[PDB]
Design a protein around this ligand. Structure first.
Ligand SMILES: C[C@H](CS)C(=O)N1CCC[C@H](C(=O)O)C1
Ligand SMILES: [Zn+2]
Ligand SMILES: [Zn+2]
Length: 228
């Protein structure tokens, strides 16, 4: 179930996949959960998204050491907001190679984040240029277009039914898309549908701010984004 480890929560989603959850008090919204992923690929571990803070991200690494006990080969972060990139310095202090969309790295300083060490770039069709994501194993990285932010990226896990929409996708019963100050209102709806079409076999949709949901999360998020 939900394994409490300090102030974080870990949930196993598949034999080699876990969801990490961390919380930040956001004045006005309560204590906001943010989810990322941990994937074991043979003898190494891959991380998708930091926690909100360096201290929480160090706790993710401590949980990995206790429950998996294999080296963390790399982390990929899915856009330049605090819930996804707030713990970059903890990854760097641990010697972990970090990757983000080139545009996320460009935006990181003005968003108050530390950039990742390596920049991903994407083909016209949205799939990562393979030379920019070396040794990613089962992680399949896709840029669906601007939506929640201009830089948001998404990740499928080969060998599982899981795809990660990050903060682009909301659950089946969300009422709004949240803060939209950085959003691309013209393109959001198409980007959400593009994520669904890039991972057509994924039946478990993991996202930043809700528990894992069915593909109705994608259709509902798209159906909601159609209106704007
Ligand atoms: C700090 C994050 C970066 S995505 C944020 O802005 N949030 C957290 C989730 C609830 C609100 C929403 O957008 O749904 C606002
Ligand atoms: Zn965000
Ligand atoms: Zn978010």
């Amino acid at each position: 179930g939900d394994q409490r480890f300090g102030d974080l929560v870990f949930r196993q989603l598949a034999p080699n996949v876990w969801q990490h959850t961390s919380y930040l008090d956001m004045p006005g919204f309560g204590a906001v959960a943010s989810n990322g992923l941990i994937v074991r690929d043979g003898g190494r571990v891959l991380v998708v998204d930091t926690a909100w803070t360096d201290d929480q991200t160090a706790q993710i690494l401590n949980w990995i050491k206790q429950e998996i006990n294999l080296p963390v080969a790399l982390a990929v972060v899915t856009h330049a907001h605090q819930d996804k990139m707030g713990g970059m310095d903890a990854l760097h202090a641990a010697g972990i190679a970090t990757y983000a969309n080139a545009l996320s790295n460009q935006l990181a300083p003005q968003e108050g984040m530390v950039a990742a060490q390596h920049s991903l770039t994407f083909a016209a069709n949205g799939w990562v240029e393979p030379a920019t994501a070396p040794n990613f194993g089962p992680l399949k990285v896709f840029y669906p277009g601007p939506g929640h932010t201009s830089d948001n990226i998404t990740v499928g896990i080969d060998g599982t039914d899981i795809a990660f929409g990050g903060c682009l996708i909301k659950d089946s019963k969300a009422k709004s898309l949240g803060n939209l100050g950085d959003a691309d209102t013209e393109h959001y709806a198409a980007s959400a549908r593009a994520f669904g079409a890039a991972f057509p076999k994924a039946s478990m949709i993991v996202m930043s701010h809700s528990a894992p949901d069915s593909r109705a999360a994608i259709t509902h998020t798209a159906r909601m984004a159609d209106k704007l």
